[PDB]
């Protein structure tokens, strides 16, 4: 892969990859994902148990690593660009938001004593968010603790609360949950603004500091 990369921010460290995925890839992934979609879950900050929460109202599913030719190419592309080996990557998570669905601002790094355990590949360091559709109204990735907020037209009010990224088909957002020294980066607070008009389909790669297993 090689495409235009737009530096979004340093705090947090955020980069937008233009045309990361082909339309054809985006379409394929949504199609495989549709039948398997269920309510998304979060982990309790203290316990690490996976639970249902008003916080997060998408549906999602998972693809195991290497279980599909199309996604395997993408997988390798994500390892290439992040410069972290495939062993450290969670499976592909596909998500859907529509009709008010959202994900309130949160951190991808774990607070709990279980989920950033050695067995689990240690802490989450970087996330790739691949937008599989272009969203008419809302569904921006918002980073409220960014150094620089967006303003003017074509951004929801939700999105003016931070630095924000309009979901566009084929684009991917890369951002770091950790500083280069491995400390938590609180500047990396992020969410998904309510999707108002449109079906927001995205895919994520949550990559750890160490091999999962």
């Amino acid at each position: 892969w090689r495409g235009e990369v737009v530096h979004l921010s340093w705090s947090p460290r955020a980069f937008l990859l233009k045309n990361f995925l082909s339309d054809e890839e985006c379409d394929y992934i949504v199609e495989k994902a549709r039948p398997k979609m269920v309510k998304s879950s979060v982990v309790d900050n203290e316990s690490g148990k996976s639970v249902d929460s008003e916080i997060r109202t998408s549906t999602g599913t998972w693809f195991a690593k290497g279980e599909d030719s199309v996604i395997s190419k993408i997988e390798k592309r994500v390892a290439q660009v992040t410069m972290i080996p495939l062993e450290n990557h969670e499976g592909l998570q596909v998500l859907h938001y529509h009709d008010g669905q959202k994900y309130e601002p949160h951190y991808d790094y774990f607070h709990d004593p279980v989920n950033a355990g050695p067995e689990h590949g240690g802490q989450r360091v970087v996330t790739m968010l691949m937008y599989l559709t272009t969203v008419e109204e809302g569904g921006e990735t918002v980073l409220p603790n960014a150094e620089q907020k967006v303003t003017g037209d074509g951004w929801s009010e939700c999105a003016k609360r931070g630095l924000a990224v309009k979901p566009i088909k084929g684009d991917a957002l890369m951002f770091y949950s950790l500083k280069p020294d491995g400390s938590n980066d609180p500047a990396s607070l992020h969410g998904s603004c309510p999707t108002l008009k449109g079906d927001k389909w995205s895919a994520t790669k949550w990559i750890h500091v160490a091999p999962i297993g």
């Binding site: 979060v42 982990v43 900050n45 969670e90 949160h106 790094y109 989450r124 949550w206």
Partner: peptide, 6 residues
């Protein structure tokens, strides 16, 4: 909170 793992 954090998205549930793989």
């Amino acid at each position: 909170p954090s998205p549930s793992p793989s």
